[PDB]
Design a protein around this ligand. Structure first.
Ligand code: ATP
Ligand code: ATP
Ligand code: MG
Ligand code: MG
Ligand code: MG
Ligand code: MG
Ligand code: MG
Ligand code: MG
Ligand code: NA
Ligand code: NA
Ligand code: NA
Ligand code: NA
Ligand code: NA
Ligand code: NA
Lengths: 380, 380
């Protein structure tokens, strides 16, 4: 299942031979390839090697991006995580996570599971100077790809009016995964002109009222929320706006079936705790309740009416911009490998020479279940 | 774990010795006791022996009540289950399921998991003549206990103004579980004066418009829905009103945590399919969306505010009526055995000589999680 070349590497990293065999047989490690280069991807955790870690050789090991804990009560979340010490407050940008690293003579861009993304790898030169990797070849840039023309999301931050943008939020060492302190990271981003998530400033528990005001502005502006980081990057906590929880439900409700466990419940919970903590009552409360009822039912009922007539499946349309038509071919292949039913719906050339590709992604498992229910399937 | 007396019985029922040992070691069969009488309860299925089956000896075997399939699209559900043949339409009564059987010289009442219910066993003479069991000692009466003074539910049908009532919906053979045809069951209920679920009549697919009208009336009347049964009792399908789905959410949302998987999602799905099938749009649609948002958020936020100050836990209050004070003592013991934190809050004697017991049921697992979140616990 997995070559002894990679298993030798895992052994030298101190992993036990028996654990490697178990990971192999269960499919917790898998081999992959990009542009002819073989690498190992960790589908599950293995001692200190986090999920989404990729292994090309003994030196080029890109650690998986860690989970970020969230709180649902902002004031008491801050007191428990940070007490009264200062912490940085950054914008949470609603996109997809990327790790950017120099591998051999190539700059590769990895998404969360450890896949080389062919779109982001082609485009990354539009946002990040290669100079950074001439000077720091063993550092990994971590950030969010976000905007209205995204291959993986149908929403994005409102101030990105077209195409897509990179937003740096961490710099990590190859192999160890260690993060630079906030200040050194921000100094490097300025030195190299790497675009950064907005840094709102340095806060503490005593400034909770200003953070609530910040959350209300981010909400009105359709932005996702904040991420709170101790200066040494060891304590990290995220907190998202009611807009993000409501809009997430709206998007997911078109499909409803086959989503991650708890997708809707977790967001209803986050909304309830926001309303409780902010003591929201009366008409302002009713407006959230009406909005939640609408985003749960309207997209869902619309899809039901859609599938009740015809053979067409539930579908999302999205566009991306590419420099080379061959990149779009490579995204189709990559989408197939991820077991997604996506084809090219439309192509246009833009006045700046870029290709705008319109993709159509269909959802056959959600479609099947929704249709069987409409057609009267009885179930326990 | 389980006595060889009961294992001998399972062997004579054709079960394999190895399966018995597995069921024992996993806890799929467990011993229980009521008023000194030992019996075996099936916590999981075992070949033809359904979950909730109880075994006292070789003759007294009460088969677990089968799952009833539901549809979420009424018209196509009827076409798929019944085609154009006639079927009976009964009221779905919102209570708890009981099986009533003569065991030795005792009439015992079993709830769904196979527990002897001490409350319903004391009270069952108020609703069912013992004459039935003098004439049919090997038949089991199956029905719903429902009303405003229930030990297990906080809602009920509106026309039961006080106390609680039994509603027959099946008659089954001991040991085999076989159901009498609808007509013979209804003839027996009339012969013995056993109160019955309302039988709305005989319907077929061609009468779908009348069934929709029936559903709209049941909805306005705060009733649960219908159960559709072929005359030979072999095809059974339930369908519940939007009122039932909305009110269920309202009740569950006070607790939110520690509920069965999919409790809220399943009901949102049922609401969406009702609105789709009935083509509900405009203001009438907005009223359902507002109602769904309110029943999800208001009870939940209210409980959050409740637990954010004090040591009191989330709690429901309910009353029952008993003939003998000793019955209330026995319900306390029984609630403890079910791993529920319930104590007696108040007692009154009624002008008819019955005791009205007020119980308080607290929810410590839901309370703990809700409080840890309020206090800023961070989680992945
Ligand atoms: N300033 C930021 N700092 C760190 N991560 C950020 C920042 N802005 C956006 N992110 C993104 O947020 C992610 C973590 O929060 P998010 O709400 O997206 O959860 P997730 O990891 O995608 O999923 P889940 O909660 O299901 O595990 C990071 O992995 C990163 O992609
Ligand atoms: N007329 C009726 N015929 C049959 N069962 C009825 C009738 N009226 C009410 N019931 C009750 O409905 C139950 C089945 O439907 P219900 O919606 O209560 O699901 P459930 O068995 O409690 O749970 P789940 O769907 O989670 O398995 C029966 O077990 C019985 O208690
Ligand atoms: Mg995200
Ligand atoms: Mg979002
Ligand atoms: Mg269609
Ligand atoms: Mg029920
Ligand atoms: Mg109910
Ligand atoms: Mg309190
Ligand atoms: Na995460
Ligand atoms: Na888009
Ligand atoms: Na053009
Ligand atoms: Na059931
Ligand atoms: Na009650
Ligand atoms: Na009195």
């Amino acid at each position: 299942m997995v070559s002894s070349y990679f298993k030798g590497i895992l052994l030298n990293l101190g992993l036990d031979e028996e654990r490697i065999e178990v990971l192999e047989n269960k499919g917790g490690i898998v081999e992959d390839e990009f542009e002819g280069m073989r690498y190992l991807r960790l589908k599950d955790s293995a001692r200190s090697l986090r999920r989404g870690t990729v292994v090309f050789d003994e030196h080029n090991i890109i650690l998986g991006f860690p989970h970020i804990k969230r709180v649902v009560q902002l004031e008491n979340g801050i007191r428990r995580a940070f007490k009264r010490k200062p912490f940085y407050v950054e914008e949470a940008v609603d996109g997809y996570n990327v790790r950017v690293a120099k591998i051999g003579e190539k700059i590769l861009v990895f998404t969360r599971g450890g896949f080389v993304c062919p779109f982001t790898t082609e485009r990354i030169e539009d946002f990040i100077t290669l100079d950074f990797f001439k000077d720091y070849p063993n550092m990994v840039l971590c950030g969010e790809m976000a905007g209205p023309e995204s291959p993986y999301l149908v929403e994005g931050p409102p101030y990105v009016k077209e195409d897509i943008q990179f937003f740096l939020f961490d710099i990590q060492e190859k192999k160890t995964g260690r993060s630079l302190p906030v200040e050194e990271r921000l100094k490097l981003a300025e030195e190299y002109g790497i675009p950064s998530v907005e840094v709102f400033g340095l806060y503490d528990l005593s400034r909770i009222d200003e953070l609530h005001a910040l959350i209300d502005r981010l909400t009105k502006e359709k932005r996702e929320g904040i991420v709170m980081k101790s200066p040494d990057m060891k304590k990290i906590v995220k907190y998202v706006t009611p807009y993000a929880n409501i809009n997430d439900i709206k998007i997911g409700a078109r499909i409803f079936f086959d989503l991650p466990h708890g997708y809707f419940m977790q967001r209803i919970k986050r909304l309830a705790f926001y309303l409780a903590e902010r003591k929201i009552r009366g008409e302002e409360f009713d407006e959230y309740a009406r909005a939640l009822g609408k985003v749960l039912l309207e997209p869902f009922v619309e899809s039901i009416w859609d599938i009740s007539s015809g053979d067409d499946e539930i579908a999302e349309l999205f566009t991306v911009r590419v420099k080379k038509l061959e990149t779009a071919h490579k995204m189709v292949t990559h989408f197939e490998r991820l077991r997604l039913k996506i084809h090219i719906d439309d192509i246009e050339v833009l006045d700046n020479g870029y290709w705008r590709i319109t993709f159509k992604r269909v959802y056959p498992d959600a479609t099947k279940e929704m249709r069987e229910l409409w057609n009267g399937h009885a179930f326990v």
